[PDB]
CSV table of C-alpha atoms and ligand atoms in Angstrom, one decimal:
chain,number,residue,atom,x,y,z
N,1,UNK,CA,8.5,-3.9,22.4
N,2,UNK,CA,10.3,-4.6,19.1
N,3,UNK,CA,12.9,-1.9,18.2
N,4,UNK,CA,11.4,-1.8,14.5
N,5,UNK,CA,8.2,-0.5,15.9
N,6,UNK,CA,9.2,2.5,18.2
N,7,UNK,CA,9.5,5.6,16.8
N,8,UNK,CA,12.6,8.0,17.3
N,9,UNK,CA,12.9,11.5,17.5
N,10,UNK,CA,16.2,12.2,16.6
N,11,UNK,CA,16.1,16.1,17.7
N,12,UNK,CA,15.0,17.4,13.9
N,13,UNK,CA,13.1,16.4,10.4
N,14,UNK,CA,9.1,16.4,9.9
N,15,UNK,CA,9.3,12.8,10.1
N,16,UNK,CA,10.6,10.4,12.5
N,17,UNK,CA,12.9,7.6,12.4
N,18,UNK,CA,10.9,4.2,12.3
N,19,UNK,CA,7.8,6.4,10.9
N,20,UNK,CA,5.2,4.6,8.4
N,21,UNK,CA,5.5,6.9,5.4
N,22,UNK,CA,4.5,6.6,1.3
N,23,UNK,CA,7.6,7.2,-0.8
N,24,UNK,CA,7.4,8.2,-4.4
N,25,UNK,CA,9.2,6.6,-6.8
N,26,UNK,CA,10.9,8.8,-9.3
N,27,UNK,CA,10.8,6.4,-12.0
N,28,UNK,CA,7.5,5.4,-11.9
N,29,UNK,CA,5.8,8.7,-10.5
N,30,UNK,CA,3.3,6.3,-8.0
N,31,UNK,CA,3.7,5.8,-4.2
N,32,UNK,CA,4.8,3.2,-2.3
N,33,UNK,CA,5.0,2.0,1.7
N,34,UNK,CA,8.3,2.3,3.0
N,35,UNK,CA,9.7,3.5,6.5
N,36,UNK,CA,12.0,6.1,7.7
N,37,UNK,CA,15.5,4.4,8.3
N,38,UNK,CA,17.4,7.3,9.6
N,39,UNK,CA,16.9,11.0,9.6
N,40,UNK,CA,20.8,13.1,8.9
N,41,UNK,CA,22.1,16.5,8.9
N,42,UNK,CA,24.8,16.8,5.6
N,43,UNK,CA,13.9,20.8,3.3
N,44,UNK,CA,17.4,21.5,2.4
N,45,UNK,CA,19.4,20.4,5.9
N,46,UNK,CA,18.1,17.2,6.9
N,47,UNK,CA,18.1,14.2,5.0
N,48,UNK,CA,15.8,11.2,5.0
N,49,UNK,CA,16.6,7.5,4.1
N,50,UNK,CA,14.0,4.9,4.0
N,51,UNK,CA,13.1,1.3,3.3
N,52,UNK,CA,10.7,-0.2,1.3
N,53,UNK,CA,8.2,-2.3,3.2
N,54,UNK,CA,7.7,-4.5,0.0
N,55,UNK,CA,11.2,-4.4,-1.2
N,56,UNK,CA,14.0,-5.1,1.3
N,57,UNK,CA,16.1,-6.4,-1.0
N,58,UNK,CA,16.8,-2.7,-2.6
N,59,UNK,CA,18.2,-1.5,0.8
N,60,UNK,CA,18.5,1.6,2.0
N,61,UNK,CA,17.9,4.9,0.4
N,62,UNK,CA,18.1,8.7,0.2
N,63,UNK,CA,14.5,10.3,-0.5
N,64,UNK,CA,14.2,13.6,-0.5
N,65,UNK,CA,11.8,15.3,1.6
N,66,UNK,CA,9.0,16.2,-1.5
N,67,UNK,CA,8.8,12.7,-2.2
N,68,UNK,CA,7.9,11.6,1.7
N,69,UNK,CA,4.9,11.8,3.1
N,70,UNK,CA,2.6,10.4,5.6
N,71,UNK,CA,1.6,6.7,5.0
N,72,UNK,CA,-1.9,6.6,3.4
N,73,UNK,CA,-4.4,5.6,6.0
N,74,UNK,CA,-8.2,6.9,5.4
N,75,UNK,CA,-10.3,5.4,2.2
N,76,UNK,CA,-12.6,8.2,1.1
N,77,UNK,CA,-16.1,7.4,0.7
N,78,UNK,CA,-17.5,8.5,-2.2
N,79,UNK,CA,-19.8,11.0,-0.9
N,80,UNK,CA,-16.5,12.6,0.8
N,81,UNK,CA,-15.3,12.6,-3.0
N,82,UNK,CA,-15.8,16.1,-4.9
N,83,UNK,CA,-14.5,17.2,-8.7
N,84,UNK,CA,-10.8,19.1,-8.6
N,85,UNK,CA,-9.7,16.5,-5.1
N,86,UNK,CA,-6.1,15.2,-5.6
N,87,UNK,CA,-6.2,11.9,-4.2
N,88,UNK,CA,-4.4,8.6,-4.2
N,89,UNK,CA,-5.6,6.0,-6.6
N,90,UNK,CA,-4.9,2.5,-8.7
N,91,UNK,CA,-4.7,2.7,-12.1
N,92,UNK,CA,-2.3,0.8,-14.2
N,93,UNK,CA,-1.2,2.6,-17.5
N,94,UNK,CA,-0.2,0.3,-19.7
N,95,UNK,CA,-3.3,-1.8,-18.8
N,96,UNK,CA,-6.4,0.7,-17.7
N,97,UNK,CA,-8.5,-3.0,-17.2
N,98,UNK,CA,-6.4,-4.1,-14.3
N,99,UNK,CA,-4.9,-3.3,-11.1
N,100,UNK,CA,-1.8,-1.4,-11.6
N,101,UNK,CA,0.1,1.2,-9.3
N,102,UNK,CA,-0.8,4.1,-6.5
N,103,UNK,CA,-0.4,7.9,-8.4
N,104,UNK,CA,-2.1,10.8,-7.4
N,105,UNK,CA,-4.5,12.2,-9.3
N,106,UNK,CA,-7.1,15.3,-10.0
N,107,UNK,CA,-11.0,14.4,-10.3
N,108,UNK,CA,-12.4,14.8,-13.6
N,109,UNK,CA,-15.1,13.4,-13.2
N,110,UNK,CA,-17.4,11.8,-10.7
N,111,UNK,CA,-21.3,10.2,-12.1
N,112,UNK,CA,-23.0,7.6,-10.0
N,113,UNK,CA,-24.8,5.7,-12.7
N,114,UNK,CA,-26.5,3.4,-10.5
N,115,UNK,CA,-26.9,1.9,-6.7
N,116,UNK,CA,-24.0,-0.3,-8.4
N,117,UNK,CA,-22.4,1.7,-11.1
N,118,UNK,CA,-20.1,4.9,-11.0
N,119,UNK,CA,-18.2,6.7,-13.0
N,120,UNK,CA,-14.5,8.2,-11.6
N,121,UNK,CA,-12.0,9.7,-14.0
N,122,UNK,CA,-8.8,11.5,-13.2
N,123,UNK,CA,-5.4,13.4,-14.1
N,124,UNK,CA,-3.0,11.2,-13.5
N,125,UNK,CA,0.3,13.0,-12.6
N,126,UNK,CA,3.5,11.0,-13.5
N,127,UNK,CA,4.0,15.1,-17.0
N,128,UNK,CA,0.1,14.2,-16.8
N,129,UNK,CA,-2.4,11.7,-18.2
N,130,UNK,CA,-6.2,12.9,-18.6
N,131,UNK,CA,-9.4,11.3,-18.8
N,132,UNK,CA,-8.0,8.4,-16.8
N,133,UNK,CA,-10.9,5.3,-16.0
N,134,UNK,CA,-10.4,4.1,-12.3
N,135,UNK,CA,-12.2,1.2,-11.6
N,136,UNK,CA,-11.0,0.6,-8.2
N,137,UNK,CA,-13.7,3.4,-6.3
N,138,UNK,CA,-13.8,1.3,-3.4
N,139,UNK,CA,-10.3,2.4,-2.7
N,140,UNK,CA,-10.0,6.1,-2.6
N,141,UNK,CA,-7.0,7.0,-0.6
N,142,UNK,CA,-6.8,10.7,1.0
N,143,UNK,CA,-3.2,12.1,0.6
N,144,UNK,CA,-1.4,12.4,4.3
N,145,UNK,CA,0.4,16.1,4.9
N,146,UNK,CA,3.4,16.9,7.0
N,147,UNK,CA,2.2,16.7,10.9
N,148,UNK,CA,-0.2,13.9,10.7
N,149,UNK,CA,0.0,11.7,13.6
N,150,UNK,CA,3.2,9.6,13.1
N,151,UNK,CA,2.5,6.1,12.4
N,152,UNK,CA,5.1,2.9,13.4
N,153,UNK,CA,4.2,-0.8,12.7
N,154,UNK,CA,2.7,-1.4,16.2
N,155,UNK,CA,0.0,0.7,14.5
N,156,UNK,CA,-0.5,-2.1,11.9
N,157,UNK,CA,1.1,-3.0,8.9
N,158,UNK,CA,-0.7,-0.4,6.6
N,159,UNK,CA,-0.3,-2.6,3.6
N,160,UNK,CA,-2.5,-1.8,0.3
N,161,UNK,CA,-3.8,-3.9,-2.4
N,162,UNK,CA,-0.7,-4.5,-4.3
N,163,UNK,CA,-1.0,-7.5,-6.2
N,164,UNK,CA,-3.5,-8.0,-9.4
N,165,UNK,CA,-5.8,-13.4,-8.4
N,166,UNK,CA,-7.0,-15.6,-11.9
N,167,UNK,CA,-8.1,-18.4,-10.0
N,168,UNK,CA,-10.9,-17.6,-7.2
N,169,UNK,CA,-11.4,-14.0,-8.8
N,170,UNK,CA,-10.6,-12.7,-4.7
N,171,UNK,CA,-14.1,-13.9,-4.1
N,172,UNK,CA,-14.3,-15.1,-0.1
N,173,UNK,CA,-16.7,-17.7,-1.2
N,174,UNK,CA,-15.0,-19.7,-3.3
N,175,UNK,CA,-12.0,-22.2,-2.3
N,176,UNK,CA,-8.7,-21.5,-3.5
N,177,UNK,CA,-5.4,-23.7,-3.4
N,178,UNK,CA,-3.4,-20.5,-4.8
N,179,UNK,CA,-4.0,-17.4,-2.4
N,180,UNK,CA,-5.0,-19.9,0.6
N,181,UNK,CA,-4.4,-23.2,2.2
N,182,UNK,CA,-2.7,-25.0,-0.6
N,183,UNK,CA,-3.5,-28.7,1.2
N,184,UNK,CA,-7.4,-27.9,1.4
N,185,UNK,CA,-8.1,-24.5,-0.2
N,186,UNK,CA,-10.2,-23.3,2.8
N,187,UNK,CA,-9.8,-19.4,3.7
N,188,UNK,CA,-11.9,-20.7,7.0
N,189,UNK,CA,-9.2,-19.6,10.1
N,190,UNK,CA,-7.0,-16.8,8.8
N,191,UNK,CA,-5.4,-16.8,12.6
N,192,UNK,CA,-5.1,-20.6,12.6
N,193,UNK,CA,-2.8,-20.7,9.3
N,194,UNK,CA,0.4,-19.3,8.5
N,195,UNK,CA,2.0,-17.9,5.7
N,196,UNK,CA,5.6,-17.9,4.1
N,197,UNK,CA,8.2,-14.8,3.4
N,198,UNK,CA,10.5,-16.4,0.7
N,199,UNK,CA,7.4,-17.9,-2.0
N,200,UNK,CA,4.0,-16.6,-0.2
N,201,UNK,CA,1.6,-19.6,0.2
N,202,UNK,CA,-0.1,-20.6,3.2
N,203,UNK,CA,-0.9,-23.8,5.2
N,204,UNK,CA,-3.1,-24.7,8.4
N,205,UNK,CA,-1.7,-25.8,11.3
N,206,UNK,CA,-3.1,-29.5,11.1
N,207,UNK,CA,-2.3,-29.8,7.5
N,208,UNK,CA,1.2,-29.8,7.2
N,209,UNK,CA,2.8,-32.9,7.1
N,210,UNK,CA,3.8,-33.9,10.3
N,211,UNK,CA,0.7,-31.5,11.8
N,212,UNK,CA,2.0,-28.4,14.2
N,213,UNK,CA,0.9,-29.0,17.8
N,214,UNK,CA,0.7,-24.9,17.6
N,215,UNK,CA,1.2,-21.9,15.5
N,216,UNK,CA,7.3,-18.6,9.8
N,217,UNK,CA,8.7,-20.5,7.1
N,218,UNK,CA,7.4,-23.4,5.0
N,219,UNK,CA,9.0,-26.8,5.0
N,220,UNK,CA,9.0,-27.7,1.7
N,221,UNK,CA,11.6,-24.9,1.0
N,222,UNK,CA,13.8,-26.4,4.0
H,301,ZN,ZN1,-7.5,-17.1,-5.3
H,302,ZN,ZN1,-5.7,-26.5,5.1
H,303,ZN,ZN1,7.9,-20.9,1.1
């Protein structure tokens, strides 16, 4: 059992240390993974510290306890969805086109055009933007309340779709040397490939140069 993975009840707080939670970033207004580092006495007694999943490198920090919540874990479908639910969704607001951040948000509006198309627009709550287009439906998050089942990375990683690809367009048909193999471009065998923590790019076990008997770091870097 790793010790990052067990969860610790420290004898008080709503949310445990080691606990998967979403943190809300102040100066942005939109949510991201972090976990509960430790949980302190000095709503108003205990105080919570996290880390950022995705941003080690800004260490620890005090959250307070209105801007902690549950790590986001269910996709609504969009029959689940109704007009006036506050959920969790992508937008990006200084470029409605493309992928941007995770902010809650009111439903406005909900039309299903087509078998293919649908219309979703919310109120965005940094202050609040209205009439907002989100083109990511497919990934509807429901918002996570105090007392949910407490979550720890032996759960899973509960990682969302952070990143905007240019190349393969995230198709799983087409090849790609820039979000897969970089030797071959095959996506074939994500178990027999690993991947890289400082720059992020992948290689198979029998194309490195020398080959790996078996399944981490790159070697180009070292
Ligand atoms: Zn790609
Ligand atoms: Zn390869
Ligand atoms: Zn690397």
């Amino acid at each position: 059992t790793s010790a990052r993975a067990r969860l610790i009840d420290p004898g008080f707080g709503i949310y445990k240390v080691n606990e998967l939670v979403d943190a809300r970033d102040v100066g942005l207004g939109a949510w991201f993974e972090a976990h509960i580092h430790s949980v302190t006495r000095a709503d108003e007694d205990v105080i919570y510290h996290i880390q950022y999943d995705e941003y080690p490198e800004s260490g620890t920090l005090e959250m307070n306890v209105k801007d902690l919540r549950p790590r986001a874990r269910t996709i609504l479908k969009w029959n689940e969805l109704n007009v006036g639910d506050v959920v969790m969704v992508n937008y990006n607001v200084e470029s409605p086109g493309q992928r941007g951040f995770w902010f809650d948000a009111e439903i406005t509006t909900l039309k299903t055009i087509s078998r293919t198309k649908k219309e979703l627009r919310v109120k965005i709550f940094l202050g609040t933007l209205n009439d907002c287009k989100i083109i990511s439906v497919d990934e509807i998050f429901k918002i996570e309340r105090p007392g949910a089942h407490p979550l720890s990375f032996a759960d899973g990683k509960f990682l969302r779709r952070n990143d905007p690809c240019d190349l393969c367009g995230g198709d799983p048909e087409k090849k790609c040397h820039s979000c897969s193999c970089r030797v071959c471009g095959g996506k074939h065998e994500p178990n027999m490939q690993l991947l890289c923590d400082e720059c992020n790019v992948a290689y198979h076990i029998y194309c490195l140069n020398p080959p790996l008997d078996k399944v981490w770091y790159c070697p180009s870097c070292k």
